[PDB]
Amino acid sequence: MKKYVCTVCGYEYDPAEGDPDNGVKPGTSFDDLPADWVCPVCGAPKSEFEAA
């Protein structure tokens, strides 16, 4: 359930919510995001998220 924050824009990935519009169901951990997933607010890579 660990949240991660985008260091570009401040969006928080919340595993309890997932990211349905990008094919990520509620409950999906950050580490299990698809390899091509990017921040939905700004487009930044996962490599620029940090644990929040």
List residues binding Fe ion (CB under 5 A). 6, 8-9, 11, 39, 41-42, 44
Distance in angstroms (rounded) separating the CA atoms of residues 44 and 10? 11
Nearer to Fe ion, 6 or 24 (CB): 6
- Segments of 1-52 assigned E as strands: 4-6, 12-13, 49-51
Distance in angstroms (rounded) separating the CA atoms of residues 3 and 50? 9
- Least separation in angstroms between CB 32 and Fe ion: 19
- Least separation in angstroms between CB 27 and Fe ion: 21
9 labeled part of a ligand binding site:
yes
List residues forming the annotated binding site for Fe cation: 6, 9, 39, 42
